[PDB]
Swiss-Prot record, chains A, B:
Subunit-structure text: Homodimer.
Protein family per UniProt: Belongs to the nitroreductase family.
Cofactor(s), by name: FMN
GO annotation (BP), single: tyrosine metabolic process
Job of this protein: Catalyzes the dehalogenation of halotyrosines such as 3-bromo-L-tyrosine, 3-chloro-L-tyrosine, 3-iodo-L-tyrosine and 3,5-diiodo-L-tyrosine. Activity towards 2-iodophenol is weak.
UniProt name for this protein: Iodotyrosine deiodinase
Gene that this polypeptide is encoded by: IYD
UniProt keyword list: Flavoprotein, FMN, NADP, Oxidoreductase
Matches recorded under InterPro entries: Nitroreductase (IPR029479), Nitroreductase-like (IPR000415), Nitroreductase/BluB (IPR050627)
Catalysed reactions listed for this entry: 2 iodide + L-tyrosine + 2 NADP(+) = 3,5-diiodo-L-tyrosine + 2 NADPH + H(+); iodide + L-tyrosine + NADP(+) = 3-iodo-L-tyrosine + NADPH; 3-iodo-L-tyrosine + iodide + NADP(+) = 3,5-diiodo-L-tyrosine + NADPH + H(+); L-tyrosine + chloride + NADP(+) = 3-chloro-L-tyrosine + NADPH
Effect of residue 86 to A: Strongly reduces affinity for Tyr by more than more than 2600-fold and reduces affinity for I-Tyr by 18-fold
Binding site for L-tyrosine: 39, 66, 70, 90
Originating species: Thermotoga neapolitana (strain ATCC 49049 / DSM 4359 / NBRC 107923 / NS-E)
Residues at which FMN binds: 9-13, 36-37, 174
Length: 184, 184
């Protein structure tokens, strides 16, 4: 049942050392590629980063940006990150066997909406295949974009470390859906 | 496999009048609600429109805005709309038994990304239940927002007509997924 896949999927920020077969990632990209999109533009592009030096570069730029973010963060965001024990450290950016970078085509109508919709598909497909992921959004996308020679027509949306999950922390709660009818 | 569900799912712009059980629609919201989100804020909000008067108001406000849009659109979207023989009339906004209005909580971090990801889950769940949908995005959400007394805290992201498909048109093609390694 799809609800079972969705309910069981949780963030994974800690991965096994072993590298999953690329076929599993490709499968999940093929699932995502079946998603709808504005104008059927299919505005998602994928970059699979496996090179260890490059992952380390990405980790370093993101951690340097997170350090500044964590120094400055305030209020609700700070409290949430503190209560979940987040810090600027992002070891998974180096340790995950794959970094799946997801880009949107700037010129496509509803490109960013469509790519995030497709990311929904992608995440469920990774769960189906027994892989873990976290949608990681660093403070400064441009620095990561430059590291991988991103063309001007593309926009990095999210970094998805992918790998075999390793002793994940539990899924956070979900409040029940409360619907409204006709009008607020 | 999830791939088969994703491959099968296509736009539905032709609906039966027959009303699906509410639980079939609620199921899809329950699946979507299991999705990840920025800071686990669960920033989606659902408004189920069924009242025929209100559906008509929404339809006419959207059609007016579309008619102006179709008079003025140019470039690639105009070319695609023309070759698909799209027009500004939106009968599915009356014919669908449900208009599911999906909102994002503006104050939540990565609210829009998170809601569109959940919409990806939602569309797959609707397909699992044999329901059809189209992510309808009219040119002027503000007028629709006002019609349903949207609070200032929420942004209407998409109108999802939901119903039983009435022999919908075939799925459009998909280019092969575009996957690169390490750098562009
Ligand atoms: C973000 C987004 C916005 C969309 N907006 C509209 C819309 O305003 N009107 C419409 O008829 N279809 C809309 N669609 C549906 C697309 O036209 C459709 O997903 C695309 O043609 C692929 O259809 P297929 O899956 O049947 O091949 C939208 C889809 C997405 C993802
Ligand atoms: C748009 C978006 C951005 C996210 N950004 C980050 C991030 O920058 N760092 C991180 O650790 N997790 C990030 N997450 C993961 C969320 O914190 C996670 O989905 C949420 O805590 C719920 O986790 P659960 O499904 O395991 O309960 C992001 C999630 C989404 C949807
Ligand atoms: N909203 C208009 C035009 C339109 C149509 C399809 C589509 O994928 C996109 I993005 C826009 C209409 O519904 O006709
Ligand atoms: N990017 C920072 C903060 C962060 C964390 C979780 C999250 O859901 C969101 I949105 C932001 C970090 O990765 O620590
Ligand atoms: Cl997550
Ligand atoms: Cl097409
Ligand atoms: Cl669609
Ligand atoms: Cl939480
Ligand atoms: Cl917003
Ligand atoms: Cl149709």
């Amino acid at each position: 049942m799809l609800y079972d896949l969705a309910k069981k999927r949780k963030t994974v920020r800690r991965f096994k050392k072993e590298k999953p077969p690329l076929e599993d990632l490709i499968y999940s990209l093929k699932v995502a590629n079946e998603a709808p999109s504005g104008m059927n533009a299919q505005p998602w592009r994928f970059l699979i980063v496996e090179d260890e030096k490059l992952k380390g570069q990405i980790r370093r730029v993101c951690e340097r940006s997170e350090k500044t973010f964590y120094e400055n963060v305030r209020g609700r965001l700070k409290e949430w990150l503190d209560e979940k024990r987040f810090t600027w450290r992002k070891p998974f950016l180096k340790e995950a066997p794959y970094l799946l970078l997801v880009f949107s085509e700037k010129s496509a109508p509803y490109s960013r909406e469509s790519v995030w919709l497709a990311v929904g598909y992608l995440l469920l497909a990774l769960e189906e295949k027994g892989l873990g992921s976290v949608p990681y959004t660093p403070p400064d996308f441009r620095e990561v974009e430059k590291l991988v020679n991103t063309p001007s027509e593309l926009r990095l949306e999210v970094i998805l470390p992918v790998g075999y999950p390793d002793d994940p922390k539990p899924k956070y709660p979900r409040n029940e859906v409360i619907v409204r009818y006709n009008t607020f």
